[PDB]
Scaffold this active site. Structure first.
Site, PDB file in Angstrom:
ATOM      1  N   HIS A  49      -1.967  -2.911   8.717  1.00  0.00           N
ATOM      2  CA  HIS A  49      -3.110  -3.265   7.880  1.00  0.00           C
ATOM      3  C   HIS A  49      -3.920  -2.052   7.413  1.00  0.00           C
ATOM      4  O   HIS A  49      -4.166  -1.127   8.191  1.00  0.00           O
ATOM      5  CB  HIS A  49      -4.010  -4.216   8.685  1.00  0.00           C
ATOM      6  CG  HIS A  49      -5.278  -4.598   7.995  1.00  0.00           C
ATOM      7  ND1 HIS A  49      -5.303  -5.405   6.878  1.00  0.00           N
ATOM      8  CD2 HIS A  49      -6.568  -4.285   8.265  1.00  0.00           C
ATOM      9  CE1 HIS A  49      -6.555  -5.572   6.486  1.00  0.00           C
ATOM     10  NE2 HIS A  49      -7.342  -4.903   7.309  1.00  0.00           N
ATOM     11  N   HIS A  86       0.691  -1.282   0.000  1.00  0.00           N
ATOM     12  CA  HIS A  86       0.000   0.000   0.000  1.00  0.00           C
ATOM     13  C   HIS A  86       0.718   1.331   0.000  1.00  0.00           C
ATOM     14  O   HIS A  86       0.042   2.355  -0.036  1.00  0.00           O
ATOM     15  CB  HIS A  86      -0.990   0.039   1.164  1.00  0.00           C
ATOM     16  CG  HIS A  86      -1.813  -1.198   1.295  1.00  0.00           C
ATOM     17  ND1 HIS A  86      -2.724  -1.590   0.338  1.00  0.00           N
ATOM     18  CD2 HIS A  86      -1.820  -2.168   2.240  1.00  0.00           C
ATOM     19  CE1 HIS A  86      -3.256  -2.749   0.684  1.00  0.00           C
ATOM     20  NE2 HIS A  86      -2.726  -3.121   1.836  1.00  0.00           N
TER      21      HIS A  86
END
Length: 134
Positions: A129, A16
């Site tokens: 996360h 990400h």
């Protein structure tokens, strides 16, 4: 399943974090390499790892997608981002996967936790996360 050789924080950054991402079709290669089937959709936050670790340091909130976890952190700023959408779902060989690039801009919510022993000691709390973007 996270490849064993990468800590939760490194796998997070690989999936990400990218200031200047290449085309999705190219960027996603390294991620799918550790998967059985091609990832349906992936989001890159166009920011720096250092900047996400800051988000980790603020107010704590229950994780939107998993309310049992109370270690989530929303960014205060909406951040530019890049969505990679799989074109050939449940179809084209999970070897030559193609992606459509899609710009976007929103707040992100990450879950943070204590670093893994092998992570840089520079940061005690690391993002592990990406929960969602609002």
């Amino acid at each position: 399943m996270r490849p064993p050789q990468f800590t939760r924080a490194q796998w997070f950054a690989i999936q990400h974090i990218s200031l200047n991402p290449p085309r999705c079709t190219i960027a996603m290669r390294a991620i799918n390499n550790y998967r059985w089937r091609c990832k349906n959709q992936n989001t890159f936050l166009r920011t720096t790892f250092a900047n996400v670790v800051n988000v980790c340091g603020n107010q704590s909130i229950r994780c939107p997608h998993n309310r049992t976890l109370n270690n989530c952190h929303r960014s205060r700023f909406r951040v530019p981002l890049l969505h990679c959408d799989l074109i050939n779902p449940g179809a084209q060989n999970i070897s030559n996967c193609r992606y459509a690039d899609r710009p976007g801009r929103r707040f992100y919510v990450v879950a943070c936790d204590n670093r893994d022993p092998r992570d840089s000691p520079r940061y005690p709390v690391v993002p592990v996360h990406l929960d969602t973007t609002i």
